[PDB]
């Protein structure tokens, strides 16, 4: 989950299954076989395009072999990487909770010729590999139709929503502990007596250390302009009161 | 089944050689009406001057050896042909970084009974646009996109704009950069006689909050201590620390503003 | 000369077919015996938790419709075949970062006259592995490497091991990281009964000299001056310089061990 | 015209199956002679231990079923052929970092009427070599190159050298790294007997001026101020500034010298 470029790259296993009508036979006549496995360049397959792409394949491209049943029900699970684009809101930087989406749909057939029906409303996580930094709260998929600008038919699509939190202990122990720890040194220089000759050493060192912490926290957040992060407003008000 | 007999009839490789162009009547032009439609501006990259966009490029033209009588095939008006199996004029970018010239997907194409072909593939495109840097961070950039044909010229194909603006109703907010206008022009050259292209001009503007809060405010707070070492009496023995540290914080801020902007 | 006659006899498409598998006598399985052989640890990158290796994987199975008598063909026990025009099992990585699943080259397969087929391609692989960091940098990592089948499962093929370590014969030594042990296990799920995998584990010890010289010696030489501001007398006016310089040097070392180690 | 009749005669795919090897009497060998001609040494990268070079390697071998009777084809001694359609002996790298194994152009091969085939493709290669750094920056580095066959072995093809020192008169000079000596020799394993390779050694030397000027002179000019602090009087109030700033400049130089050298 890349916050400077606002991207999300996942490794996912797309499961599709459908019917046809010419790929059917009688199992009693061909020595009692039921199911075969033919490679997936030789049949029809539908065209499923991620609409939300940013530096993405825009379709599956590994082409795993397909399972065809006697009755014409075929099924197909090709794996893919996908590089989706989402919008990052960051106000509570220490304990964030983001919402990043995906939008699958068919490219050039409409609702009176092809039709998506979502199967299970969860995203199936029976072999998630535990990434450590982020945990999935929720992962749902909502069915949608939309009418576009070109053509007068309507088009179905399925929008997946991913609600993920950040486990916050690493940025707690490495960023707001030294910032909040040198932030209690700002009010101290008035206690120091003025014939020591050591006051403006302390004011210059506190001002330059908060300036280094603000110019290092401008790396990790994206450069948006709808919000400001709540740590950056505190660092700006502390720099105002130090000067 | 009748769709199968039509798709077998239309792409007979004895009948249909896809390397020729559909000229009739003693070398008329074919007219490729294109119009482009944005999806999202992904990123404007100031340091290497690359604008990455994601765009849909609707091209439609006229063919003449892909027709049928619709009574003979039980009232089809409109079929789908696997794209790149038919003829297509190569319409690409021309100001390109990284050498990806053609489109990214090669989807299906929708053939009527007229011979009119419709086509809409997507692309991600990386154009190389020239950054105005004077009023940073309040500036107003202007980036270009130039679509030319790739292998043909002006006596053979003929690009025609469809509508004067690029479309924008299938787009999401780009956040940091907002749009002002998107005109599109057809340039022919009067002198060359073999040169048509369609150039769009994205005119964008930076939302100036974030670079103000993280750059202009600590620069103003550091340069407000420029005039202050004269008001400080000399017997403390601390003038040198204040003016030396003001000059060092000022030169570190000059090098950071030197590493954001491009080196033009 | 006769080897061309043998390749013409075996891969005839009337006699041989590619898309089916050697299963007769009422759905027998086949046994794919696989074992890997290491070449070099290229890199362990802690910052994105990834590991790049260079693995030959050696597969043997038994394909029954590739046989001849060698007296007809000049006492040949052994030929080469192109690796696309036979059957393959499909064995890939399962926990792969960046999507590149299968092997690199498809090198040639050595086919005997029993039908027993020996085959080894080269591959590079970028596996993901959970970095255990508490004793940094004297640590001992544990990086997994899984292998499953891709299209088939346990009621059609059956993976089995050869020997219980990976072969370390062509392992050139690496420099930074040093191996300790490489066990190999076969796992199987008893609630599903349609699942095999063969997983290798690599248990790696880091040579500790480099990060000691750059990070442990200046950290102990800076934290040995923490309790020394008190013995300094108050007349000289130098307590603030020593204690402020110790606090800023410890914050700079805390941000360097922030930027190296993974952000779990 | 007659050359065109000859090239249709020679590469006829009923006559000439590509992926067998040219031998006639009960498995006799073929001899592949090779030598290496350098073009330039581009870079030696010390952070990741990788040498990038430009090298044309010349291979010549001897086929038998590329023969014509040259007074039938109107006194032709020497044709060119494209090298995707004849046999190749596979000669690759073997210590290769970043995983490109074949050559980069696949140029034409010159075929004489005897069958002796001359071939010279160009390549760039990213070889891996082990940088030793004790006498930095005056050292004498050593980087090797293995050429090994890829799908064959010692009882099938046999790599013979031609010149003990590889060719160096097409060399552009390299700026930093001058070349001292460059031999090459044949290795063969006395207990394995399925192993031939030809290894070249490159013995390169730094030119030491630029690293002396930038990292020995400011290092010595900083570290001569270690002994200075005892010659201050104590009453000035300026001891701790000098010795604290000397310690922080020294640890900055230790980290930058440790960013140049490898983490071996
Ligand atoms: C025919 C050919 N291409 C199309 C592309 C698209 C649509 C309709 C098309 N109809 C909209 C629906 N899906 C992708 C875009 C938009
Ligand atoms: C918990 C939460 O806020 N989830 C929202 C979801 O309801 C919404 O449909 C999606 C798109 O706006 O963004 C996210
Ligand atoms: C030293 C250690 O714990 N190594 C472990 C190994 O025992 C275990 O089989 C494997 C899977 O958890 O991961 C690793
Ligand atoms: C250079 O390295 C090779 C490989 O270890 C070795 O055979 C050779 O003796 C070395 N020569 C010198 C001069 O270091």
Residue numbers in the entry:
A (entry chain D): 50 to 292
B (entry chain E), C (entry chain C), D (entry chain B): 2 to 265
From the article:
We hypothesized that the addition of a 50 kDa Fab, with its distinctive elongated two-domain shape, would facilitate accurate orientation of the proteins, even when most of their structure is embedded in the membrane.
The cation-selective nicotinic acetylcholine receptor (nAChR) is a prototypical member of neurotransmitter-gated ion channels of the Cys-loop receptor family. The human α4β2 subtype is a heteropentamer and the α4, β2 subunits can assemble heterogeneously (2:3 or 3:2), which have nearly identical secondary structures. Construct no: 8 with BRIL fused in the α4 subunit was the best behaved and SDS-PAGE analysis of the construct showed that the ratio of α4:β2 in the receptor is 2:3. For cryoEM sample preparation, the expression was repeated for this selected construct in the presence of the partial agonist varenicline, purified to homogeneity as a complex with BAK5 and vitrified for data collection. We determined the cryoEM structures of the sAB bound receptor at a global resolution of 3.7 Å and 3.9 Å. The two copies of sAB bound to the two α4 subunits fused to BRIL were readily distinguishable indicating that the module was introduced without disrupting the structure of the subunit. BAK5 bound to the BRIL-fused α4 subunit broke the pentameric pseudosymmetry of the molecule, thereby enabling facile particle orientation during data processing and reconstruction. Insertion of BRIL did not introduce any local or global distortions in the structure as evident by superposition of the BRIL-fused α4 subunits with the α4 subunits from PDB ID: CNJ12 without any BRIL fusion (RMSD Cα = 0.7 Å).
